[PDB]
Amino acid sequence: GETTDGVYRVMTRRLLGSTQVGVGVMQEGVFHTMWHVTKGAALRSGEGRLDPYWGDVKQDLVSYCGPWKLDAAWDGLSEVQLLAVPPGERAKNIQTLPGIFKTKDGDIGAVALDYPAGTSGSPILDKCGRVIGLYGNGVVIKNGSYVSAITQGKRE
Amino acid sequence: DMYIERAGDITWEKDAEVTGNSPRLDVALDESGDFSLVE
Numbered sequence: 001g002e003t004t005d006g007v008y009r010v011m012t013r014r015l016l017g018s019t020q021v022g023v024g025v026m027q028e029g030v031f032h033t034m035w036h037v038t039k040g041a042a043l044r045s046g047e048g049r050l051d052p053y054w055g056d057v058k059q060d061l062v063s064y065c066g067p068w069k070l071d072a073a074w075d076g077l078s079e080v081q082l083l084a085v086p087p088g089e090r091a092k093n094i095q096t097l098p099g100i101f102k103t104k105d106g107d108i109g110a111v112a113l114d115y116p117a118g119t120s121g122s123p124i125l126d127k128c129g130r131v132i133g134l135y136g137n138g139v140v141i142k143n144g145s146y147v148s149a150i151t152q153g154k155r156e
Numbered sequence: 157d158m159y160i161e162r163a164g165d166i167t168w169e170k171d172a173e174v175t176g177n178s179p180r181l182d183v184a185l186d187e188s189g190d191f192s193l194v195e
């Protein structure tokens with residue numbers, strides 16, 4: 001199948017027509033997405049099969065074909081870009097200054113951008129085009145507005 | 157059965173549309189990977 005680096009849609013034909021259930025990142029021959037998009041199931045790329053390699057429900061992340069490769073981090077000061085890939089629509093960059101999720105275990109960047117659920121797994125990038133995390137695991141605040149964590153894994 | 161389709165390169169776009177605020181929120185993360193607001 002296609003192994004070129006880039007952003008990909010994750011689709012299924014199990015429901016009505018072809019449905020986009022999420023998005024992910026191919027980098028260094030490894031496919032990266034959020035666990036809730038695939039639930040750890042195998043994927044197809046053309047006639048090739050991608051098998052899960054690593055995953056964690058609490059981080060809400062999963063990698064296919066190899067270990068998690070994305071290790072860039074938000075600098076805590078600069079604007080970033082969400083490369084949103086909404087269902088049925090072209091990939092589009094949206095620039096924003098992240099907010100912060102403060103937790104008992106430390107602080108995480110967060111982006112206050114609201115897209116359809118099938119956009120989950122879309123990458124968030126720094127100015128060098130490095131992926132600093134994936135969009136789609138977050139919360140609904142007072143206003144009813146959605147805010148996603150910038151969710152990043154660990155490169156072993 | 158799930159399958160993948162390429163949608164683009166991962167690059168920064170100069171003069172991209174700029175939007176969104178920057179909230180600072182106290183949150184909790186449970187064993188199921190769900191975030192919740194702590195108030």
Ligand SMILES: c1cc([C@H]2CCCNC2)c2cc[nH]c2c1
Nearest residue numbers: 036115116117119120136137146
């Ligand atoms: C991204 C991801 C989601 C998913 C995450 C899993 C549970 N809720 C749906 C949503 C819901 C509303 N906007 C969203 C953006």
